[PDB]
Symmetry: C2
Subunit: 66 residues, 2 copies
Amino acid sequence: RTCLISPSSTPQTCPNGQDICFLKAQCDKFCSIRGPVIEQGCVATCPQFRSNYRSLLCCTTDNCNH
Amino acid sequence: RTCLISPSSTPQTCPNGQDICFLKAQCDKFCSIRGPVIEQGCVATCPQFRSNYRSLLCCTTDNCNH
């Protein structure tokens, strides 16, 4: 499908297998002052939820990861 | 924490030990007369991604499940 991409959050077209879009907010040792580290794009699966995240969003819809 | 709750989406403090809130949405047959079934609450572990799901948001912050 198509999903949004990180930095700029624009559209990009997945390859076969990347049927799912995601938005992932994760925390470094400096989550509290910097903020979480965001990363969106095309995944093939929904990444299992690491304790360090402020949140995961996994959606099958184009550009749904926003 | 206090997470948003399904039928009505009023905040409710997770039973001590449940810190992550989630928002789920899948379609059923009336997925065109109403839209997807939306279920939101408190959990222990973020739910397993499930193919037949329109979306699944797992966040750890108050009433974020929205």
